[PDB]
Ligand binder design. Structure first.
Ligand code: 5GP
Ligand code: 5GP
Ligand code: ZN
Ligand code: ZN
Lengths: 115, 115
């Protein structure tokens, strides 16, 4: 069946499952992480379903560039003293939801610890 | 004076300062992190000098998309069991070098700890 009917982040992006919205437009949806690891922890997703960064193609690279530009616009507004962007791909990175999502982290001097 | 003459990552990208090269082409340069926080820890930079993600514009967003596509090509080769991509912007994120660089991290089940 379809991603629209099955994917948790597709549903959050269509407001079929609630979230605390930070920003949205026709292309992207940004909302607060439910289990934050920093005092500011925002997820930014495309509304369209793309499973991970490994699904970027030479053909959709421009759109992912646009998503990253919008990530920066959100980051510089919400985190004027700096922010970290994180994307997790697959098992070793702990990727849970298979709908690409950029983490925006900030609000403190963020740790840089061995992983 | 010019970035080519002053910026550590511009110089590494032109091989004016040594690094352990992972991949390069006319657009990007990827090399091993000197102080790794994971068993695979690669930095990917554009050869052109762009200071941080906050310098992405609606006009260069396509090129940054291309850089991120190439990050994914490097990640999926070097880290077939998954990888994490990190970008640090400004003080709170600990951004040291003001030449945009994507961290590719992997080679183990990566921690997800409070920052
Ligand atoms: N707001 C919200 N965040 C979620 C939900 N499900 C998962 N998350 C967050 O999504 C993130 C998934 O990141 P991943 O580990 O896949 O990179 C986690 O930080 C997790 O807490 C949800 O239903 N609502
Ligand atoms: N290979 C190499 N890595 C460097 C050099 N200088 C800084 N680095 C790495 O560059 C990264 C900078 O990341 P930042 O904290 O700015 O995101 C750090 O992980 C640091 O160890 C260098 O001269 N050579
Ligand atoms: Zn989805
Ligand atoms: Zn530079």
């Amino acid at each position: 069946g379809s991603m629209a009917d099955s994917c948790i982040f597709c549903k959050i992006a269509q407001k079929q499952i609630p979230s605390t919205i930070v920003y949205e437009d026709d292309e992207i949806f940004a909302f607060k992480d439910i289990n934050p690891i920093a005092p500011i922890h925002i997820l930014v997703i495309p509304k369209q379903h793309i499973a991970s960064l490994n699904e970027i193609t030479e053909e959709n690279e421009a759109f992912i560039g646009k998503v990253l530009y919008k990530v920066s616009l959100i980051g510089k507004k919400e985190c004027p003293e700096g922010y970290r962007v994180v994307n997790n791909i697959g098992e070793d990175a702990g990727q849970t939801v298979k709908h690409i999502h950029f983490h925006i982290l900030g609000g403190k001097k963020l740790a840089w610890d061995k992983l």
